[PDB]
Short mmCIF file of C-alpha atoms in Angstrom, two decimals:
data_model
loop_
_atom_site.label_atom_id
_atom_site.label_comp_id
_atom_site.label_asym_id
_atom_site.label_seq_id
_atom_site.Cartn_x
_atom_site.Cartn_y
_atom_site.Cartn_z
CA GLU N 1 -12.22 -47.14 -77.37
CA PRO N 2 -8.81 -45.67 -76.45
CA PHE N 3 -9.93 -45.20 -72.82
CA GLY N 4 -10.06 -49.00 -72.54
CA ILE N 5 -6.77 -49.31 -74.42
CA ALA N 6 -5.41 -46.86 -71.86
CA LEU N 7 -6.42 -48.43 -68.57
CA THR N 8 -5.00 -51.67 -69.99
CA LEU N 9 -1.73 -50.06 -71.07
CA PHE N 10 -1.32 -48.74 -67.50
CA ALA N 11 -2.09 -52.08 -65.87
CA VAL N 12 0.73 -53.71 -67.86
CA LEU N 13 3.27 -51.05 -66.82
CA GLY N 14 2.38 -51.62 -63.18
CA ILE N 15 2.81 -55.38 -63.57
CA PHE N 16 6.21 -54.90 -65.20
CA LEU N 17 7.36 -52.53 -62.44
CA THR N 18 6.30 -54.97 -59.72
CA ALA N 19 8.13 -57.79 -61.53
CA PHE N 20 11.29 -55.65 -61.72
CA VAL N 21 11.13 -54.86 -58.00
CA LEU N 22 10.74 -58.50 -57.01
CA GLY N 23 13.82 -59.27 -59.13
CA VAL N 24 16.04 -57.02 -57.05
CA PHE N 25 14.84 -58.52 -53.79
CA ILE N 26 15.65 -61.93 -55.36
CA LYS N 27 19.09 -60.98 -56.73
CA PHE N 28 20.11 -58.88 -53.70
CA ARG N 29 18.53 -61.19 -51.14
CA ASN N 30 21.41 -61.11 -48.63
CA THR N 31 22.30 -57.42 -48.26
CA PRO N 32 21.93 -55.95 -44.75
CA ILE N 33 19.18 -53.49 -45.66
CA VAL N 34 17.14 -56.03 -47.66
CA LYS N 35 17.36 -58.49 -44.76
CA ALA N 36 16.56 -55.57 -42.44
CA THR N 37 12.98 -55.63 -43.69
CA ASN N 38 11.32 -59.03 -43.45
CA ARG N 39 12.49 -60.82 -46.66
CA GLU N 40 9.65 -63.38 -46.22
CA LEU N 41 6.72 -61.04 -45.75
CA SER N 42 8.24 -58.54 -48.22
CA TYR N 43 7.96 -61.21 -50.94
CA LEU N 44 4.39 -62.11 -50.02
CA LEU N 45 3.40 -58.43 -50.21
CA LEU N 46 4.79 -58.10 -53.75
CA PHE N 47 2.61 -61.02 -54.86
CA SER N 48 -0.42 -59.34 -53.27
CA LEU N 49 0.36 -56.15 -55.21
CA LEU N 50 0.48 -58.21 -58.41
CA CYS N 51 -2.98 -59.54 -57.53
CA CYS N 52 -4.13 -55.95 -56.91
CA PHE N 53 -3.15 -54.63 -60.34
CA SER N 54 -4.90 -57.62 -61.93
CA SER N 55 -8.29 -57.13 -60.20
CA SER N 56 -8.82 -53.96 -62.29
CA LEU N 57 -8.84 -55.90 -65.57
CA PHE N 58 -12.17 -57.45 -64.48
CA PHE N 59 -13.94 -54.11 -65.14
CA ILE N 60 -13.16 -53.94 -68.88
CA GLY N 61 -15.50 -55.56 -71.39
CA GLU N 62 -19.11 -56.66 -71.51
CA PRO N 63 -20.21 -57.66 -67.98
CA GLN N 64 -21.06 -61.30 -67.34
CA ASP N 65 -22.27 -63.26 -64.32
CA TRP N 66 -18.92 -64.62 -63.14
CA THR N 67 -17.08 -61.35 -63.84
CA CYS N 68 -19.68 -59.33 -61.93
CA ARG N 69 -19.46 -61.82 -59.06
CA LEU N 70 -15.64 -61.77 -58.94
CA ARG N 71 -15.22 -58.00 -59.41
CA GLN N 72 -15.17 -56.76 -55.76
CA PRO N 73 -14.05 -59.68 -53.53
CA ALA N 74 -10.75 -60.12 -55.38
CA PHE N 75 -9.67 -56.51 -54.85
CA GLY N 76 -10.94 -56.50 -51.27
CA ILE N 77 -9.03 -59.66 -50.36
CA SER N 78 -5.84 -58.46 -52.05
CA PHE N 79 -5.89 -55.05 -50.35
CA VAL N 80 -6.60 -56.50 -46.92
CA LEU N 81 -3.79 -59.01 -47.51
CA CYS N 82 -1.37 -56.13 -48.14
CA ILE N 83 -2.62 -54.26 -45.07
CA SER N 84 -2.24 -57.35 -42.87
CA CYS N 85 1.30 -57.91 -44.14
CA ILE N 86 2.27 -54.33 -43.28
CA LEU N 87 0.64 -54.53 -39.84
CA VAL N 88 2.25 -57.82 -38.81
CA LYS N 89 5.70 -56.70 -40.02
CA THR N 90 5.46 -53.48 -38.02
CA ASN N 91 4.41 -55.19 -34.80
CA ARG N 92 7.26 -57.72 -35.01
CA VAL N 93 9.93 -55.00 -35.17
CA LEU N 94 8.41 -53.00 -32.33
CA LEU N 95 8.43 -56.23 -30.30
CA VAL N 96 11.99 -57.02 -31.36
CA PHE N 97 12.99 -53.48 -30.35
CA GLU N 98 10.94 -53.55 -27.14
CA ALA N 99 12.93 -56.51 -25.77
CA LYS N 100 14.05 -56.43 -22.14
CA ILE N 101 15.42 -59.98 -21.63
CA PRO N 102 16.42 -62.42 -24.47
CA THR N 103 14.20 -64.60 -26.79
CA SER N 104 12.82 -68.05 -26.14
CA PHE N 105 11.38 -69.44 -29.46
CA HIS N 106 11.55 -73.22 -29.04
CA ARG N 107 11.67 -74.24 -32.75
CA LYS N 108 13.19 -72.05 -35.48
CA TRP N 109 10.74 -73.11 -38.20
CA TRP N 110 7.52 -72.75 -36.19
CA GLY N 111 9.05 -69.44 -35.20
CA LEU N 112 8.23 -68.24 -38.69
CA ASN N 113 4.78 -69.86 -38.51
CA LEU N 114 3.42 -67.00 -36.50
CA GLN N 115 4.71 -64.58 -39.11
CA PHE N 116 2.51 -66.26 -41.72
CA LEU N 117 -0.58 -67.44 -39.75
CA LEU N 118 -1.41 -63.96 -38.42
CA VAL N 119 -2.00 -62.69 -41.97
CA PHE N 120 -4.38 -65.57 -42.68
CA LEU N 121 -6.19 -64.91 -39.41
CA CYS N 122 -6.69 -61.29 -40.47
CA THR N 123 -7.92 -62.30 -43.95
CA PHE N 124 -10.25 -64.99 -42.56
CA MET N 125 -12.98 -62.49 -41.61
CA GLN N 126 -13.39 -61.18 -45.14
CA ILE N 127 -12.99 -64.58 -46.78
CA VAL N 128 -15.93 -65.57 -44.56
CA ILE N 129 -18.00 -62.55 -45.51
CA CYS N 130 -17.33 -63.09 -49.20
CA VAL N 131 -18.40 -66.76 -49.04
CA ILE N 132 -21.63 -66.32 -47.10
CA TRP N 133 -22.56 -63.38 -49.32
CA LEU N 134 -22.00 -65.21 -52.59
CA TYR N 135 -24.08 -68.21 -51.56
CA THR N 136 -26.98 -66.34 -49.92
CA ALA N 137 -27.44 -63.78 -52.75
CA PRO N 138 -24.95 -63.85 -55.66
CA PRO N 139 -24.60 -60.80 -57.91
CA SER N 140 -25.96 -61.10 -61.44
CA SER N 141 -26.02 -59.13 -64.68
CA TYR N 142 -28.90 -56.79 -65.45
CA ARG N 143 -29.79 -55.13 -68.76
CA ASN N 144 -31.21 -51.68 -67.98
CA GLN N 145 -33.04 -49.66 -70.61
CA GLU N 146 -35.49 -47.72 -68.41
CA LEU N 147 -33.27 -44.76 -67.48
CA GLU N 148 -32.60 -43.45 -71.02
CA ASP N 149 -34.89 -44.22 -73.94
CA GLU N 150 -32.45 -44.58 -76.85
CA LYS M 1 -4.26 -87.09 1.92
CA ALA M 2 -0.77 -85.99 2.86
CA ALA M 3 1.23 -86.83 -0.26
CA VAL M 4 -1.02 -85.15 -2.82
CA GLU M 5 -1.47 -81.93 -0.82
CA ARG M 6 2.23 -81.62 -0.01
CA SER M 7 3.24 -82.27 -3.62
CA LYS M 8 0.66 -79.84 -5.03
CA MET M 9 1.63 -77.04 -2.64
CA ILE M 10 5.35 -77.54 -3.27
CA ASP M 11 4.88 -77.59 -7.05
CA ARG M 12 2.71 -74.46 -6.96
CA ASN M 13 5.24 -72.55 -4.84
CA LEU M 14 8.14 -73.69 -7.03
CA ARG M 15 6.33 -72.65 -10.21
CA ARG M 16 5.49 -69.26 -8.69
CA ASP M 17 9.15 -68.75 -7.75
CA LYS M 18 10.29 -69.79 -11.24
CA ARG M 19 7.84 -67.36 -12.85
CA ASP M 20 8.95 -64.56 -10.52
CA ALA M 21 12.62 -65.27 -11.33
CA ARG M 22 12.10 -64.46 -15.03
CA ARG M 23 13.71 -61.00 -14.76
CA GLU M 24 17.33 -61.45 -13.68
CA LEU M 25 20.84 -61.11 -15.06
CA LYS M 26 24.33 -62.25 -14.06
CA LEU M 27 27.75 -60.74 -14.76
CA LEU M 28 31.23 -61.59 -13.49
CA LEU M 29 33.90 -59.07 -12.47
CA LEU M 30 36.94 -61.04 -13.59
CA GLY M 31 39.88 -58.74 -12.91
CA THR M 32 43.57 -58.90 -12.13
CA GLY M 33 45.06 -58.24 -8.72
CA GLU M 34 45.61 -54.69 -7.44
CA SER M 35 42.94 -53.40 -9.84
CA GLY M 36 40.97 -51.53 -7.17
CA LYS M 37 38.00 -53.91 -7.16
CA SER M 38 36.73 -52.63 -3.81
CA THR M 39 37.33 -49.01 -4.83
CA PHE M 40 35.46 -49.49 -8.12
CA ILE M 41 32.57 -51.33 -6.43
CA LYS M 42 32.17 -48.74 -3.66
CA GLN M 43 31.50 -45.86 -6.07
CA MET M 44 28.62 -47.65 -7.80
CA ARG M 45 27.31 -49.13 -4.54
CA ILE M 46 27.06 -45.69 -2.91
CA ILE M 47 24.43 -44.59 -5.44
CA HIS M 48 23.23 -45.49 -8.91
CA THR M 49 37.93 -65.40 -0.23
CA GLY M 50 34.33 -66.48 -0.68
CA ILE M 51 32.32 -65.84 -3.83
CA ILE M 52 30.22 -62.75 -3.06
CA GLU M 53 27.49 -61.46 -5.37
CA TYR M 54 26.22 -57.88 -5.34
CA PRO M 55 22.45 -57.63 -6.00
CA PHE M 56 22.12 -54.41 -8.00
CA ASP M 57 18.64 -52.91 -8.18
CA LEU M 58 18.53 -51.30 -11.63
CA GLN M 59 15.25 -50.42 -13.35
CA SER M 60 12.89 -53.38 -13.78
CA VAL M 61 15.90 -55.77 -13.71
CA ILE M 62 17.80 -57.02 -10.66
CA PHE M 63 21.42 -57.15 -11.78
CA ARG M 64 23.81 -59.59 -10.10
CA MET M 65 27.57 -59.04 -10.15
CA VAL M 66 29.74 -61.85 -8.78
CA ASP M 67 33.31 -61.45 -7.52
CA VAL M 68 35.46 -64.32 -8.81
CA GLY M 69 39.02 -62.96 -8.80
CA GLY M 70 39.68 -64.03 -5.22
CA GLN M 71 39.85 -67.80 -5.70
CA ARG M 72 43.56 -68.79 -5.75
CA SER M 73 42.96 -72.17 -7.40
CA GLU M 74 42.36 -73.73 -10.81
CA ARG M 75 39.94 -71.77 -12.98
CA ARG M 76 38.90 -74.29 -15.66
CA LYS M 77 37.54 -76.67 -13.02
CA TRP M 78 34.80 -74.27 -11.88
CA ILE M 79 34.45 -71.94 -14.88
CA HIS M 80 31.76 -74.29 -16.20
CA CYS M 81 29.31 -72.91 -13.62
CA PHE M 82 29.11 -69.55 -15.43
CA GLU M 83 27.76 -70.29 -18.90
CA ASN M 84 24.55 -68.24 -19.00
CA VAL M 85 26.44 -65.03 -18.15
CA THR M 86 25.94 -62.49 -20.93
CA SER M 87 29.00 -60.27 -20.40
CA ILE M 88 32.51 -60.21 -18.94
CA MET M 89 33.51 -57.07 -17.03
CA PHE M 90 37.25 -57.55 -17.37
CA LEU M 91 39.42 -54.95 -15.63
CA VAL M 92 43.01 -53.72 -16.00
CA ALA M 93 45.21 -51.01 -14.51
CA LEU M 94 47.11 -48.68 -16.84
CA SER M 95 49.99 -48.03 -14.42
CA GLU M 96 51.53 -51.51 -14.77
CA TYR M 97 53.57 -50.59 -17.86
CA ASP M 98 56.39 -49.26 -15.65
CA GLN M 99 55.38 -51.02 -12.39
CA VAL M 100 57.72 -53.95 -12.93
CA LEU M 101 57.20 -57.17 -10.97
CA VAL M 102 60.08 -59.12 -9.42
CA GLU M 103 58.34 -61.24 -6.75
CA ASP M 104 59.95 -63.59 -12.16
CA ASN M 105 61.20 -60.27 -13.54
CA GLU M 106 58.29 -59.62 -15.89
CA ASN M 107 55.95 -56.64 -15.98
CA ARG M 108 52.38 -57.18 -14.81
CA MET M 109 51.14 -55.99 -18.22
CA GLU M 110 52.33 -59.29 -19.70
CA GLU M 111 50.41 -61.23 -17.05
CA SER M 112 47.29 -59.13 -17.62
CA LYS M 113 47.52 -59.68 -21.38
CA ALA M 114 47.96 -63.43 -20.86
CA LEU M 115 44.92 -63.54 -18.57
CA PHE M 116 42.84 -61.56 -21.08
CA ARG M 117 43.88 -63.88 -23.91
CA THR M 118 43.07 -66.96 -21.83
CA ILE M 119 39.64 -65.64 -20.84
CA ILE M 120 38.67 -64.49 -24.35
CA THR M 121 40.03 -67.64 -26.03
CA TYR M 122 37.63 -69.85 -24.04
CA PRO M 123 35.24 -71.60 -26.48
CA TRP M 124 32.53 -71.59 -23.80
CA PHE M 125 32.37 -67.77 -23.78
CA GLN M 126 31.07 -67.39 -27.33
CA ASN M 127 27.66 -65.72 -26.87
CA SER M 128 28.79 -63.20 -24.23
CA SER M 129 29.99 -59.64 -24.72
CA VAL M 130 33.25 -58.23 -23.34
CA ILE M 131 33.53 -55.06 -21.26
CA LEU M 132 37.09 -53.77 -20.82
CA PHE M 133 37.25 -51.21 -18.02
CA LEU M 134 40.53 -49.30 -17.74
CA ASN M 135 41.18 -47.78 -14.31
CA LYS M 136 43.83 -45.56 -12.72
CA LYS M 137 44.11 -43.34 -15.79
CA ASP M 138 45.44 -40.40 -13.76
CA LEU M 139 48.79 -42.08 -13.06
CA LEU M 140 49.38 -42.86 -16.74
CA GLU M 141 48.32 -39.35 -17.76
CA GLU M 142 50.58 -37.68 -15.19
CA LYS M 143 53.76 -39.76 -14.81
CA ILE M 144 54.95 -40.38 -18.36
CA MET M 145 57.81 -37.88 -18.56
CA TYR M 146 59.98 -40.29 -16.53
CA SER M 147 58.43 -43.57 -17.75
CA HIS M 148 58.74 -43.68 -21.54
CA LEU M 149 57.71 -47.05 -22.96
CA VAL M 150 60.12 -47.22 -25.91
CA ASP M 151 62.26 -49.69 -23.95
CA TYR M 152 59.67 -51.17 -21.57
CA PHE M 153 57.44 -51.90 -24.59
CA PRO M 154 58.41 -52.72 -28.19
CA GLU M 155 55.45 -51.23 -30.09
CA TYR M 156 55.45 -47.57 -28.98
CA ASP M 157 57.67 -45.86 -31.55
CA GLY M 158 55.69 -42.66 -31.21
CA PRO M 159 56.70 -39.00 -30.93
CA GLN M 160 59.55 -39.17 -28.40
CA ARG M 161 60.58 -40.54 -25.00
CA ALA M 162 54.95 -36.34 -22.51
CA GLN M 163 51.52 -36.03 -24.17
CA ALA M 164 50.24 -39.39 -22.97
CA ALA M 165 48.13 -41.41 -25.42
CA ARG M 166 46.19 -44.34 -23.96
CA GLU M 167 45.19 -45.47 -27.46
CA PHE M 168 48.42 -47.47 -27.74
CA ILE M 169 47.52 -49.74 -24.82
CA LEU M 170 43.96 -49.82 -26.15
CA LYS M 171 45.27 -51.13 -29.48
CA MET M 172 47.53 -53.64 -27.71
CA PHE M 173 44.56 -55.13 -25.85
CA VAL M 174 42.21 -54.96 -28.86
CA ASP M 175 44.62 -56.71 -31.24
CA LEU M 176 44.65 -59.72 -28.88
CA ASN M 177 41.38 -61.08 -30.24
CA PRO M 178 40.28 -63.29 -33.15
CA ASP M 179 38.81 -61.95 -36.36
CA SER M 180 35.13 -61.02 -36.64
CA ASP M 181 35.26 -60.13 -32.94
CA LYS M 182 32.19 -58.69 -31.27
CA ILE M 183 32.18 -55.04 -30.24
CA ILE M 184 34.43 -54.50 -27.22
CA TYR M 185 33.03 -51.79 -24.95
CA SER M 186 35.85 -49.96 -23.16
CA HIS M 187 35.43 -46.67 -21.29
CA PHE M 188 38.33 -45.26 -19.29
CA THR M 189 37.45 -44.53 -15.67
CA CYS M 190 39.09 -42.89 -12.66
CA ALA M 191 38.88 -42.95 -8.87
CA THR M 192 35.61 -40.97 -8.74
CA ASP M 193 34.35 -41.31 -12.33
CA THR M 194 30.60 -41.57 -11.73
CA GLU M 195 29.63 -42.33 -15.35
CA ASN M 196 30.20 -46.07 -15.33
CA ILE M 197 26.93 -47.73 -14.30
CA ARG M 198 25.26 -46.10 -17.18
CA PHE M 199 28.09 -47.31 -19.49
CA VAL M 200 27.34 -50.84 -18.24
CA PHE M 201 23.58 -50.56 -19.04
CA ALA M 202 24.53 -49.25 -22.42
CA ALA M 203 26.56 -52.36 -23.23
CA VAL M 204 23.93 -54.66 -21.72
CA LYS M 205 21.15 -53.20 -23.88
CA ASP M 206 23.34 -53.39 -26.84
CA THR M 207 24.50 -56.95 -26.00
CA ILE M 208 20.88 -58.16 -25.89
CA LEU M 209 19.44 -56.19 -28.82
CA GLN M 210 22.06 -57.50 -31.09
CA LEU M 211 21.28 -61.09 -29.98
CA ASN M 212 17.49 -60.96 -30.32
CA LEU M 213 17.80 -59.22 -33.60
CA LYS M 214 19.93 -62.24 -34.62
CA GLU M 215 17.29 -64.69 -33.26
CA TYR M 216 14.16 -63.20 -34.93
CA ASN M 217 16.34 -63.32 -38.07
CA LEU M 218 15.73 -59.64 -38.83
CA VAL M 219 19.54 -59.31 -39.03
#
């Protein structure tokens, strides 16, 4: 049906637009305004948005056990990943701009460890909930013919 | 049980003092002679040969300004002590263009420029901002009709031999700096110009924000 052909022909346009955007941030990766926003966490967000557009393509076609099991957790994890990225980026700048006396980070590299581990800490709670759920009662397909006769 | 108790108490007190000393700052008032150091200090101290430090009590930070001009000895041998200082409050007087010195028949502007170049050129002072206070503006503004600088200075081919413009001396001091120089904060003051302490806090906040923004790599 064209409705299916449609949702698919949107979810390719979104993928292409996200790919185009990541290309600028890769070509113009040293301009003052690009570096103004976190050029690490800005990249990770773009990948999460790519994951988001893709989750939708698991609702098209005849449902199966693995598809029905993977339908919701993928989108939930991707969206919470994006939200965590936004939240951690915002707090860093407020902290940078709420500075009285100078910094004291002891190692430059571990310095950017906090930037990445906070996102994983935020996502840990839903990765937990997804795992326990799937093992203690996985979703499954179900052919229903009771509601309408024909 | 003497040794353990004494050591533990001393370590605890020292750690408490170190933690309490987290909020502090140091600045040096390196200025030339006859720059009105006492006059400038008195105005800010009223409200808002030994090395004497003035413990300012600004908001949430105890500022410390140290007087170092009155030494009369070698400077490189003890300049190593000040390395954590975040700014230099260098001071000049604008009336030395015609106030010739003969005690060497060279104008004190040349000596002030040489001192500024020596202080800025120091490789040690690389992560510290520069504050260039200009005092005694009234004399330069008033007495210029009899003190044209076309002969006393070689780079003032302006309108004619009145209408004082301090921007020429500003440019002369600014040009004496290497390329990619940090922002030089210079606000002209007077005998009773009250708006100076707040110019200082402005440069301090800016000197720090720029640095941390460099450290967290946000650029």
